[PDB]
Amino acid sequence: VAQLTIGNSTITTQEAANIIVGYGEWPSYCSDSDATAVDKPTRPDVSVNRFYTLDTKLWEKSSKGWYWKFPDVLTETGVFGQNAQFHYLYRSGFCIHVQCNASKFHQGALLVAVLPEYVIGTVAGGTGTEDTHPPYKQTQPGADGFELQHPYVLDAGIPISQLTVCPHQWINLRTNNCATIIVPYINALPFDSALNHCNFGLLVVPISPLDYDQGATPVIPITITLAPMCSEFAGLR
Amino acid sequence: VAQLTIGNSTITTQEAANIIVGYGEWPSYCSDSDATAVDKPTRPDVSVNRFYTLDTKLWEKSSKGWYWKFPDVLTETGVFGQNAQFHYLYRSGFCIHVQCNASKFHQGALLVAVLPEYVIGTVAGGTGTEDTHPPYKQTQPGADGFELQHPYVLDAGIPISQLTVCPHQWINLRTNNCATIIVPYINALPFDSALNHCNFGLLVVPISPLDYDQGATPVIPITITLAPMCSEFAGLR
Amino acid sequence: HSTAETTLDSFFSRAGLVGEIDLPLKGTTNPNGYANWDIDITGYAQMRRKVELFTYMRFDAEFTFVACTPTGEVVPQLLQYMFVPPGAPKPDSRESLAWQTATNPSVFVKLSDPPAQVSVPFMSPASAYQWFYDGYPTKDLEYGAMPNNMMGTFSVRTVGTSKSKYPLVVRIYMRMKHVRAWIPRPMRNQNYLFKANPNYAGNSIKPTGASRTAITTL
Amino acid sequence: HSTAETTLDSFFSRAGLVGEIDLPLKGTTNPNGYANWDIDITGYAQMRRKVELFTYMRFDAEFTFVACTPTGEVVPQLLQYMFVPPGAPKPDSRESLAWQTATNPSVFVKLSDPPAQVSVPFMSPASAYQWFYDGYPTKDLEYGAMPNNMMGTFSVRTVGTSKSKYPLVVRIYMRMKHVRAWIPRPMRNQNYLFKANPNYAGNSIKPTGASRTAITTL
Amino acid sequence: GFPTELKPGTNQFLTTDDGVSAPILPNFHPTPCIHIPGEVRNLLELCQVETILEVNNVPTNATSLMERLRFPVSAQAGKGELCAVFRADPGRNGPWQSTLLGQLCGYYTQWSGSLEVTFMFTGSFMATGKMLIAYTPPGGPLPKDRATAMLGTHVIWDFGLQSSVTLVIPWISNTHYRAHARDGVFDYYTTGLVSIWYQTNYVVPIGAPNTAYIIALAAAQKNFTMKLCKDASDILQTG
Amino acid sequence: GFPTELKPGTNQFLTTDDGVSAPILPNFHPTPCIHIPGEVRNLLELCQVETILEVNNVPT
Ligand code: NA
């Protein structure tokens, strides 16, 4: 156990469980001989790259699961959201740290994964004859994230049983309370629109449901802390 | 003349006539870099590989011939049959020793051969319009072996006159009373089912009929003694 | 011991039937002796789910045109297969000047000649095609649309000023080649509803596979 | 002095007629403009006895399709020869989606084009095909059945949605190549009764060859 | 000119011929590929990745589908009881259908190799007990009781000591050909069985739940392979 | 292109021509051959093996 600091942000955490480096690649920068070498892309350091701890979610027996979209999740939040909006192009990596706080008498297991291009789908009017399209509140939910309505198919017609094919980590209350994942910038272009395109989604779903006996705190806190890594912005507005 | 022993089994036999090594190949084992290298195939030594002497058959003037199926012939017999049944896969070679006991006043000649994949056929209702199929008692006759009904065509539409194209040896009473044949494991797969597939048949047929004068023992004993060589079993049950 | 059959190239090889152009004499269908087929790799049923095992892909395609009458009969007819690349105007009539625009590669061939065959390069302005795009192109109806995936269009037609004497059919086969893919994802387990999105029938959400009576009875 | 003609390859060379598919216009026979021919090397009469001189064999095959009308006439008709490999579902109708499944290699050819020709590999999951199997696959009707000898199936048909204007016939020739064999056995000397087993007519058991009056008279 | 003779096969179009054809845009220069993380080059990579095995493929009720991802163990159960059982049949219908491995087997005809199944106990930390996980090779029949299951290949798993445990299916081979109805399939027979038994009862102190769930993850080992591509699916692009 | 002249015999199918033809399954890898005892390579081997001569080909 030891507490780390980046700028003015300080989180208390355990020495070092096993971190997961998405696709074995560390988030890196983009070198000079690139498409936009005229408009030098400023690489924020100071405050922009630090610990952002979002509103804790409460895990319940009934909870189906939550997901957040990146970079959307921070585009509203502080000085990162500052750059995310008034800059034409963006690229960046992320350190994601999902932590729980529960007693040795609580039980359950969360699957924490990162899915690039997490396109959401709708129920299509139930009968599937309605070509309905997900709302903006569902597509880009902000820092509060959004709750899954049909986890089994990840609200998108795909088996969550296979979600482990993506960078992921398990949070099994009887053995660990935190998961850490490093995501490199993943896209078909070197730079892209921070507000229009969400490069990936953060999924945290209960596979083994929360449980405890009557009298124990009934809601367990899932706290997402995340820090940008090697972020770059271009074209100020 | 000298008597040899393997384990607790001891047979009395003549120094060493000419042995026949089927297809010039000695029965060998199957090395580590094989399909099942996870489930190490135990290679029985102790008691499993020893002298099994089956119920003697009585050769008569009328006798048409006998055949036995391997490994079927021992799957009932003792500790080999033990492994043959409660093991998923099997491979093995064999030393086959066919011996007669007759006086210098008896006469006749047996052809002893080994035929891999000795598929038996039926008379097909006589007219050949019935697609009848051989019984299990005929297909896999046990240690008592089975008697040929139509030797000329080896109960399978093929000329016994050409059976010599297979590993074989002659037992001509006026010159010898025993034949010995070494059979290597012969199959299109490295391992196979001991109870469902009979890798080969042992045929012993009189070509020159038994004969003797009135007063001489009228039935001559054909005694089959056989020993497994380099047997392997896999997947215990 | 070998593993070639499980390589991406192996998995995506083969020429499949992706399109079928009908050029009837009398009819409601394609009444102008011409047809415009925008290239859709999804034409081969089975393809959608397969390519969607990945997020990003890159490849070339070999197109083969097998033409005949609806009885499979071969007739003395000349045809024109024009490839109008993305960004180019497609023909709107049998007499459109597009059919004559040099920058739209055309192959002229006889129905008697063996199938026509050509190669189409990776067209995207992006580094790779991508089956999923979580965003909007600069609630909405534009969600998930990656336009930079247009491969082009094939405009088919009998040659000549006068209608063809014969009723025709052109089948388009496509073979993917030089395949590369990134970011694997869970395999679709609910039936598809629309070509453009992952929408699934929320009433009929079925289990990924077969079920049984109890977990203790095989 | 030479011995090449007695090599196994020599003994088993040549393309023989193994199959004949009839595609009549009016008829009881193959009424759906298609036919499924499971590959049977026994199609050439003479073959069975020859391959059965051995117990185990391994080889490739070159298949040649010679098509025409029953008068040997050549007509402007397009055909489809689809090879559905063992384990794959064969078409059940002229409109089966099998005809469109990419994993079933198909060759499209004109009756006017010279014979189609393709090569089929050693398909067995076993190390070799085997004409004799003394056992049962995990009194019975399954005795002697080695299933792992399936080479695949050829589904033939005229192309198109509408029936062909012409009455056709497709003859399938097969040439064995790269032959290897093991464990020779006595050559069949009694007539065959059933394709799948060695059953022989027990009433009519004939002597292997010709006879004479006495052993002392030539 | 140069003497030539056209040979049979001339003019045919073989859907699987991988020849070369004329380029439509000879001067076009495709945008260059850049580096994208996570490239896959051989499906076998995905086959080796563990995914959830729906051992509990029982509930079909839409709102209970998530329950198939986990099976329970409880106080109620008595020592020796059979907990769950399933066969090692990646390509056939059943639990493996949920695994990415099972799904990929569906695009092939034959396959073989070793498998691996990891069991994750997700009960309370305060909960303890022992389970006997057993593998019965192909042919062998499900053990009558714990006792006999113990005589075979097995693992005594103490979820008090370790939270996960991995079993290795030594070998499965979907090669034996079949010709049942009129449709020729290439099925297993190599169905080894995995049976899970309560060795001890589920032990827990006051305040700890009396039911916990186990999640099963599975994947193929490195010696795994697949042959004969076979495109098949019920999920096809719509009209 | 490259100048060519088709010669007589063009397009014929000779049952004994041992040319090469397109492979139906180019990616398929046939299970490997293992060693099986008793391979025969030339019929003459069998010809040299003694078999019974029915000198007494009389009874039928
Ligand atoms: Na000339």
Q: How far is CA A102 from the centre of its chain?
A: 21
β-partners of residue B2 are B13
The token pair at D30 is 């193959």
Domain extent for A149 = 1-237
Of B204, B6, B167, B21, the C-alpha closest to B95 is: B21
D85-113 burial, b at 16+ Cβ within 10 Å, e below that, comes to bbbbbbbeebeeebbbbbbbbbbbbbbeb
Neighbours of B209 (CB within 10 A): 13
CA distances from B57 to B167, C2, C57, C147, E14 (A): 22, 51, 73, 85, 63
Q: Which residue bears the tokens 């090692």?
A: E88
Nearest in space to D130 (alpha carbons), one of D110, D150, D103: D150
The sheet with strand C153-158 has its strands ordered as: C34-38, C153-158, C78-84, C106-110
The Cα E50–Cα A169 span in angstroms is: 12
The tokens for C179 are 């395949």
Distance E1 CA to ligand 1 centre (A): 5
Residues found in chain A: 237
Single-letter amino acid, residue B46: V
Residue among F59, B127, B149 at smallest CA distance from D200: B127
Separation between Cα atoms, residue B21 and residue C7, nearest integer Å: 46
C-alpha E69/C-alpha A151 separation (Å) is: 11
By the 8 A CB rule, do A92 and A182 touch?
Answer: no
**Contacting residues for A223 by C-beta, under 8 A, at least 6 apart:** A53, A54, A56, A57, A98, A99, A100, A101
Tell me whether the omega of the peptide bond preceding residue B116 falls within 30 degrees of 0, making it cis.
no
- Selecting from F5, F22, F29 the residue whose C-beta is nearest the C-beta of E1 gives F5
Do A174 and E215 count as a contact with CB atoms less than 8 A apart?
Answer: no
CATH number, domain of A168, equals 2.60.120.20
Two tokens at D72?
A: 């040997």
SS3 A205: strand
Q: Which helix (H) or strand (E) holds D20?
A: strand D15-23
Residue for token pair 């890798």: B199
d(CA B217, CA E26): 97
The vertex-A219 CA angle with A215 and A222, nearest 5°, equals: 145
Alpha-carbon gap: E152 to the closest alpha carbon of chain A (Å): 30
The number of folded domains in chain C is 1
Tell me the DSSP string of F7-59.
Answer: -TTTT---TT------BS-TT--PPPP---S-EE-BTHHHHTS-----TT---
With H, G, I as helix, E, B as strand and everything else as coil, classify residue A168. strand
Structure tokens at D89: 């579902």
Query: Contact at 8 Å (CB) between E180 and E37?
Result: no
Distance CA C81, CA F45 (A): 61
- The amino acid occupying position D46 is Q
**CA–centroid distance, residue F10 to ligand 1 (Å):** 17
* DSSP classification of residue E128: B
Interatomic CA distance for residues E111 and E100, integer angstroms: 15
**Short-list A206, A222, A208, CA closest to A97:** A222
Q: Longest C-alpha distance within chain A, in Å? A: 64
Residue E34: Cβ-neighbour burial (10 angstroms; 0-12, 13-18, 19+): middle
The answer to whether the Cβ–Cβ distance between F25 and D15 falls below 8 Å is: no
CB D64 within 8 A of CB D19: no
Instruction: Please report, for the domain that includes residue D139, its CATH number.
Output: 2.60.120.20
Sign of CA dihedral E225, E231, E235, E236: positive
CA–CA distance, D200 with D205 (Å, rounded to integer): 8
Provide DSSP, chain B: -EEEEETTEEEEE-S---EEEGGG-------SSSS-SSS--B---TTTSS-EEPPPEEE-TT---EEEEETGGGSSSHHHHHHHHSEEEEEEEEEEEEEE---TT-EEEEEEEEEET------TTTTS-------HHHHS-GGG-EE-S-GGGTTTTS-GGGGGGSSEEEEETTT-SEEEEEE----SSSSB-TTTB--EEEEEEEEEEEE--BTB-S-EEEEEEEEEEEEEEEEE-
* Tokens of residue B200, six digits: 């080969």
The dihedral over CA atoms of F25, D103, E38, E41, expressed in degrees to the nearest 10, equals -10
Count how many domains chain B has: 1
Chains in touch with D (3+ beta-carbon pairs under 8 Å) read B, C, E, F
* Enclosing H/E stretch for C8: helix C8-12
Residues 6+ apart with CB under 8 A from B215: none
Chains D and C touch (3+ CB pairs under 8 A): yes
> Could you count the other beta carbons within 10 Å of the beta carbon of residue A1?
6
Distance from C-alpha of B78 to C-alpha of A47, rounded to nearest angstrom: 82
Nearest CA in chain C to E196: C216
Q: Which of these, D154, D118, D152, D116, lies nearest to D36 by C-alpha position?
A: D154
Alpha helices by DSSP H, chain D: 8-12, 47-51
Q: What residue of D is the nearest CA neighbor of B138?
A: D139
Is the peptide bond prior to E137 cis by the omega test (within 30 degrees of 0)?
A: no
Q: What are phi and psi for residue E98, nearest 5 degrees?
A: -80, -25
Q: Are C49 and C59 in contact (CB under 8 A)?
A: no
Q: Which residues of C touch E131 (CB under 8 A)?
A: none
Residue C200 and residue A124: Cβ atoms within 8 Å? Answer: yes
User: What is the distance between the alpha carbons of residues F17 and E6, in angstroms, rounded to a whole number?
Assistant: 13
Indicate yes or no: CB of E177 within 8 angstroms of CB of D147.
yes
Q: What angle do CA C110, C115, C116 make, to 5 degrees?
A: 80
Q: How far apart are CA B67 and CA B51, in angstroms?
A: 19
Residue of F nearest to D206 (CA): F60
Task: Evaluate the CA torsion angle B185, B188, B193, B196 in order and state its sign.
Answer: negative
**Chain D residue numbers touching C75 (CB-CB < 8 A):** 76
Question: How distant is the alpha carbon of residue E182 from its chain centre?
Answer: 27
What the block records as the tokens of B129 is: 């319009």
**A128, A189, C142, C191, C199 from A132: Cα distances, Å:** 9, 29, 12, 16, 8
For residue C81, the enclosing domain spans 1-218
Give the one of C70, C71, C74 whose C-beta lies nearest to D110's C-beta.
C74
Distance F8 CA to ligand 1 centre (A): 15
- Helix (H, G, I), strand (E, B), or coil: what is residue E214? strand
> What string of DSSP letters covers D171-193?
EEEEEEEEEEEEEE-----S---
Nearest to E117 by CA among E133, E141, E93: E133
3-state secondary structure of A150: coil
Look at C133 and A153 and tell me if their CB atoms are within 8 Å: no
Cα-atom radius of gyration of chain E, to the nearest Å? 24
- Is E109 close to D87, i.e. CB distance below 8 A? yes
Task: Nearest chain E residue to F25 by CA: give it.
Answer: E16
Sheet strands side by side (includes A66-70): A146-147, A66-70, A200-211, A107-116, A168-172
**C-alpha to C-alpha distances, D178 to D30, D89, E91, nearest whole angstrom:** 34, 29, 33
Nearest by CB to residue D114, choosing from E6, E176, E232, is: E6
Quick one: C157 exposed, middle or buried, by C-beta within 10 A (0-12, 13-18, 19+)? buried
Q: Are D54 and D183 in contact (CB under 8 A)?
A: yes
Chain F interface residues facing chain C, Cβ-Cβ under 8 Å? 26-29, 32
CA distance B101 to B220: 6
Q: List the chains bordering chain B where 3 or more Cβ pairs fall under 8 Å.
A: D, E, F
Q: What is the 3-state secondary structure (H, E, C) of E49-66?
A: CCEECCCCCCCCCHHHHH
The tokens for E125 are 């930390």
Positive/negative CA dihedral, A135, A140, A141, A145: positive
Encode burial over B26-37: b for 16+ CB neighbours within 10 A, e otherwise: ebeebeeeebbe
Cβ–Cβ < 8 Å for E126, A188 = no
**Integer Cα distance of D100 and D161 in angstroms:** 13
Given a contact cutoff of 8 angstroms between Cβ atoms, the answer to whether B116 and B199 are in contact is yes
Show the beta-strand stretches assigned E in chain E.
2-4, 13-14, 39-40, 51-52, 71-74, 82-87, 108-121, 130-136, 153-158, 164-174, 193-198, 211-220, 225-229
Asked if E220 and E99 count as a contact pair (C-beta separation under 8 A), the reply is no
> How many Cα atoms sit within 13 Å of B14 on the Cβ side?
14
From the list C3, E96, C66, the residue with the least C-alpha distance to D110 is C66
Q: Which two tokens stand for residue C63?
A: 């197109």
| Whole-angstrom distance, CA of residue C110 vs CA of residue C76 | 7
Domains, chain E, ranges and CATH? 1-239 (2.60.120.20)
What is residue C10's three-state secondary structure? helix
Say how far apart CA F5 and CA A159 lie, in whole Å: 60
Do B186 and F52 count as a contact with CB atoms less than 8 A apart? Answer: no
| Strand (E) or helix (H) holding E202 | none
Which experimental technique did the depositors report for determining this structure?
Answer: X-ray
Interatomic CA distance for residues D114 and A7, integer angstroms: 79
Q: Please say whether the beta carbons of A123 and C200 come within 8 A.
A: yes
Three-state SS string across D82-117, please?
EEECCCCCCCCCCCCHHHHCCCCCEEEEECCCCCEE
- Contact present, E186 and D87 (Cβ < 8 Å): yes
Q: How far apart are CA A226 and CA A147, in angstroms?
A: 19
Backbone angles phi and psi of E69, in degrees to 5: -75, -5
Over the range A173-207, which residues count as b (16 or more CB within 10 Å of their CB) and which as e? Answer: bbebbbbbbbbbbbbbbbbbbbbebbbbbbbbbbb
Instruction: Compute the distance between CA of residue B70 and CA of residue B93 in angstroms, rounded to an integer.
Output: 10
Beta pairing partners, E215: E120
Give CA separation, C85 vs C19, C82, C105, in Å.
17, 9, 9
Give kind and range of the element (H or E) at residue A81.
helix A78-85
What residues form DSSP beta bridges with E155? E133
Tallying the residues shown for chain F, one arrives at 60
Q: Which two tokens stand for residue B101?
A: 């006991």
Matching residue, tokens 């598929």: B119
